Amino acid sequence: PQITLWQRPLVTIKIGGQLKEALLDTGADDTVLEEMSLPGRWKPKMIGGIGGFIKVRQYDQILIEICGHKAIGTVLVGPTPVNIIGRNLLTQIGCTLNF
Amino acid sequence: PQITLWQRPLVTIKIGGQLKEALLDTGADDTVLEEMSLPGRWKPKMIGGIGGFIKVRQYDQILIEICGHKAIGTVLVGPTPVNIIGRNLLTQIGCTLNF
Numbered sequence: 001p002q003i004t005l006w007q008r009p010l011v012t013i014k015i016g017g018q019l020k021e022a023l024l025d026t027g028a029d030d031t032v033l034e035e036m037s038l039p040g041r042w043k044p045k046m047i048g049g050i051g052g053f054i055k056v057r058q059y060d061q062i063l064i065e066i067c068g069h070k071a072i073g074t075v076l077v078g079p080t081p082v083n084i085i086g087r088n089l090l091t092q093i094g095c096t097l098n099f
Numbered sequence: 100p101q102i103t104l105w106q107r108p109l110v111t112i113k114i115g116g117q118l119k120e121a122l123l124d125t126g127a128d129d130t131v132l133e134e135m136s137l138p139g140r141w142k143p144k145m146i147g148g149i150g151g152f153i154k155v156r157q158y159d160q161i162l163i164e165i166c167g168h169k170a171i172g173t174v175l176v177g178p179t180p181v182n183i184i185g186r187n188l189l190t191q192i193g194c195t196l197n198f
């Protein structure tokens with residue numbers, strides 16, 4: 001689809017059989033979701049944003065659907081203000097910016 | 100143009116008679132630039148990202164050019180780690196997300 005930016009580009013995603021609202025974020029290198037449970041082992045990661053860095057849990061090869069488009073990649077979990085879908089997954093679903 | 104997301108979507112912008120590199124960020128409500136001088140009146144504002152909030156100066160009705168596309172809007176100035184072009188200006192140049 002083609003999404004304009006007059007409002008936040010919030011879309012429905014599906015992870016672990018549950019639906020969640022997430023922000024399509026071209027300015028985010030990674031994908032970070034609010035506290036939740038994910039399978040397997042996780043690795044440590046520090047991600048930096050406008051107000052500084054936060055520690056998150058990194059899970060790899062996680063199945064996640066974005067607007068119906070299936071992807072399998074790295075998902076970070078931590079104290080983020082909102083669920084963010086970053087470039088690692090935006091590239092998987094074939095997303096681009098156009099003007 | 101069509102911008103891929105394999106790398107951060109960085110573009111050149113022209114503002115206040117200065118050429119700067121900025122990030123096209125669909126996950127940003129506002130446009131915030133690193134410390135610089137701008138004309139006119141300003142008001143203080145607190146904006147939050149991952150990591151928390153930072154204090155910035157808000158300047159309204161500021162002319163900016165992005166990839167040759169002219170626009171006018173509010174520009175925030177403060178301690179941001181990178182120059183960010185938010186939705187308030189992305190809409191003006193007709194930028195959309197497509198997949």
Ligand SMILES: COC(=O)N[C@H](C(=O)NN(Cc1ccc(-c2cccnc2)cc1)C[C@@](O)(Cc1ccccc1)C(=O)N[C@H]1c2ccccc2C[C@H]1O)C(C)(C)C
Pocket residue numbers: 023025026027028029030031032047048049050081082084086122124126127128129130131146147148149180181183185
């Ligand atoms: C509305 O607030 C905003 O729009 N905030 C904007 C904002 O911070 N936007 N977003 C997500 C984001 C989205 C929502 C909220 C948020 C906070 C409180 C209440 N409601 C929403 C915070 C962060 C994140 C931004 O792309 C902005 C940014 C870009 C480059 C450098 C530093 C920061 C970002 O944080 N990118 C980083 C990120 C995000 C997730 C995983 C990894 C990484 C690494 C970075 O790529 C702002 C401050 C520029 C204008």
